[PDB]
Amino acid sequence: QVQLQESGGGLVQSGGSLKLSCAASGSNFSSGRTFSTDAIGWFRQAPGKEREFVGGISWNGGITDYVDSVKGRFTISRDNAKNTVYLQMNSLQPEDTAVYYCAGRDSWYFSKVPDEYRYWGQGTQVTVSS
Amino acid sequence: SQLQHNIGLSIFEPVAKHRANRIICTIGPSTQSVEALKGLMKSGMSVARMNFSHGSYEYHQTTINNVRAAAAELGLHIGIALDTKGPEIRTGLFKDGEATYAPGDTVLVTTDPAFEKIGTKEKFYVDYPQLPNVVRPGGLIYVDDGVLTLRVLSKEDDCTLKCHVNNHHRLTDRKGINLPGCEVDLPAVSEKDRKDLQFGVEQGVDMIFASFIRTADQVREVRAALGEKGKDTLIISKIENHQGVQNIDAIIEASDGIMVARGDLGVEIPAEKVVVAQMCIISKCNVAGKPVICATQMLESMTTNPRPTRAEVTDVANAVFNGADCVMLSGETAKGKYPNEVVQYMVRICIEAQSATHDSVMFNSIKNLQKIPMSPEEAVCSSAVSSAFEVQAKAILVLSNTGRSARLISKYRPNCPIICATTRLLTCRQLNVTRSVESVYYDVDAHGEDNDREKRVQLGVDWAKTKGYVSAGDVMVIVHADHSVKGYPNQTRLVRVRE
């Protein structure tokens, strides 16, 4: 219904930084839900793993949570007027090398369970070499 | 019990309900484009409303032609509703659109067409010709919903009066008057009102929102005007004064649905009363199994702001809880900066309210009021919802060509979509104001005559499946008519959906 579009991956230097961007279209006309009504989660899938949580943001941005590994290093924000979610990743490390997806849940609140989200982006590669 | 259901709610769990209520949108300057209508329709609009207190027949032909086209493009059945001007001392077209009056100011009040639009702080025009002959020096002239009040001081001329301004106010073009004395003997259909209705019958509108309906005999007047070219179009009485509320029972009986014009009511009755008046009118409409609409003041402040107020939202929620079949936006959608967002706020309010009501209680209530012996027709639709509940059905599929059946089946307020499979388009369109119904058109000319009623049932079941209602191994509830009945449906069938 709602589609998410990722962008911003690539190669970065150990200690460098990237800003992941997620742009949203359509709607769930059935529920009257749009990007701005829905919480957004950021998940990453490291090589050969499943897809763990990084951080999440409530519908109007009033609440966010982060996995401890990225706390103080990553920041999720959103501009509902531009239909976009941002993940700002600073002091990137080799351990953050993974593919990152944004996902939108049909709820005002976010979750850390991948199976609880309704629409995803295709995902973008992030590789940090030292 | 709601009490149980309430303590079982979680704000965090997603809601699952397929929306049961219907959203009525008013068309106007910001939504009249085909692309805009298409956005209204995608965002949940079931009937487009043509407010005829404004615009020419050319503006309103543009709307008809444009929703039909937008509808077509979407392959949907959208209703068209002609809201009448109504009998209404009305007055405006101010010079520069406006004028402001201070207490103590003296202002002419003329029934001369010469100042009908060069209306200034000093001389303006009141549509009622009998004003000098019905309002005497001393009494008051309520201007713009009991807000600005004028004390009459003299019949200055043959058709002009010189009046004393009580309270300050800013009057914009076209403000309604509420002369506090009755015996104004106001007609049910002004001469324009008539002429606007042939134009509606002539263009094939699905329903009239007849305005300022006071007594049942007026709802007869509206009818007769519609003619026989329009015998089959819906009349929705607009209850907007104490007389409507007073005779709500014979107005309901003689109308086809009721609209609660909440704001218009609140000119004459207190807010705390209006609350009750809505509970009351809506519920009487439930019991009569007639469609009831909430009207004025819905998500008002989302006409200029990207979000409405929490109070306005518990307001819409209440109209749903109260039992409304539809909510109607006006100005939120007609002159507003966020039409698609407001309409999508309305969808989310309905689903959340729907999700929050016990599924059964309305059924039980409406059932426990029915007198016994029930009639066959009543029992058939009653037992349908009942069976559906009992076997856990995911959709009721009724075959009705006028749709009377779907309005009966919805009167028991099931907890699943009603899929109406009709051979009339008008019926598709008109059913838009009845809770839980979703019509599906069987073009007889295009296909067989479907006397075995088999194609039509497939039609309904195909839809139920593609619309996401029902899936392999779900039980469905078919309500049609036997080959040996005068009219009405008397046959019901409990099928299982096969892969």
CATH code, domain carrying B390: 3.40.1380.20
Bridge partners of A74, per DSSP, are: A89
- Give the CB-side neighbour count of residue B193, counting CA atoms within 13 A: 23
- Cβ proximity of B422 and B403 under 8 Å: yes
- Short-list B264, B295, B228, B311, CA closest to B86: B264
What's the helix, strand, coil split of chain B in %, to 5?
35, 20, 40
What is the span of the domain harbouring residue B454? 361-497
Check whether the bond before B376 is cis (ω within 30° of 0): no
Between chains, do A32 and B346 touch, taking CB under 8 Å as contact?
A: yes
Of B324, B332, B330, B331, the residue nearest B350 (C-alpha): B324
* CA-closest candidate to residue B90, choices B162, B26, B186, B25: B186
Say what the resolution is, in angstroms: 3.2
Closest-CA residue of chain A to B346: A32
C-alpha distances out from residue B158 to B92, B109, B110, B128, B453, Å: 21, 11, 9, 14, 70
Yes or no, beta carbons of B12 and A107 under 8 Å apart:
yes
| C-alpha span between B246 and B256 (Å, rounded) | 18
Angle at B128 between CA B127 and CA B130, to 5 degrees: 150
* N-term to C-term CA, chain B: 37
Who contacts A1 (Cβ-Cβ below 8 Å, separation ≥6)?
Answer: A26, A27, A28, A29, A30, A31, A33, A118, A119
Q: Which residues of chain A from 16 to 45 reach within 8 Å of chain B, CB to CB?
A: 27, 29-34, 37
Q: Measured in Å, how far apart are chain A's first and last C-alpha atoms?
A: 40
A52 touches chain B (CB under 8 A): no
Helix (H, G, I), strand (E, B) or coil at B39: helix
For chains A and B, count residue pairs whose Cβ atoms are closer than 8 Å: 32
Residues 6+ apart with CB under 8 A from B496: B473, B474, B475, B476
Between A37, A105, A109, which is nearest B348 by CB?
A37
Q: Which two tokens stand for residue B429?
A: 């369109």
Window 110-129 of A: residues touching B by CB (8 A cutoff) are none
User: Is B307 among the catalytic positions?
Assistant: no
Instruction: Answer yes or no: are the C-beta atoms of B234 and B258 closer than 8 Å.
Output: no
Specify whether the CB–CB gap between B334 and B29 falls below 8 A: yes
List the single best residue of A28, A29, A35 to mutate versus B (max B Cβ within 10 A). A29
Q: With 0-12 CB in 10 A as exposed, 13-18 as middle and 19+ as buried, what is A3?
A: middle
Within 10 Å of residue B187's Cβ, how many Cβ atoms? 14
Q: What SS3 state is found at B464?
A: helix
Scanning B214-309, the segments in alpha helix (DSSP H) are 216-226, 242-246, 248-254, 262-268, 271-287
**Interchain contact, B44 vs A29, CB within 8 Å:** yes
What are the beta bridge partners of residue B77? none
- Shortest Cα distance from B46 to chain A (angstroms)? 13
CA dihedral (B458, B498, B18, B7) in degrees, to 10, reads 150
Question: What whole-number distance in Å separates Cα of residue B459 and Cα of residue B301?
Answer: 42
Helices B339-356 and B310-321 cross at an angle (nearest 10°) of 50
Interface with chain B: mutation pick from A30, A31, A108, highest number of B CBs within 10 Å:
A31
> DSSP label at B165?
E
d(CA A63, CA A57): 6
The CA-based angle B224-B229-B231, given to 5 degrees, is 50
Of B263, B286, B497, the closest CA to residue B408 belongs to B286
Residue A126 phi/psi, 5-degree rounding, is -130, 120
Q: Assess contact for B48 and B355: CB atoms under 8 A.
A: no
Contacts of B63 (CB under 8 A, 6+ apart): B27, B32, B48, B50, B80
Residue B249's Cα: distance from chain center in Å? 18
Closest to B23 measured CA to CA, from B324, B297, B278, B288: B324
Locate all alpha helices (DSSP H) within B82-238, ordered by sequence.
191-203, 216-226
CB atoms within 10 A of CB B153: 13
Coil, strand or helix at A99 = strand
The one catalytic residue among B26, B84, B296, B422: B296
Structure tokens at B387: 């069976």
Residue B141's identity, in one-letter code, is I
Cβ neighbourhood burial of B83 (10 Å; 0-12, 13-18, 19+):
buried
What domains appear along chain A, each with residue ranges and CATH number?
4-124 (2.60.40.10)
State the nearest Cα–Cα gap between B145 and chain A, in angstroms: 34
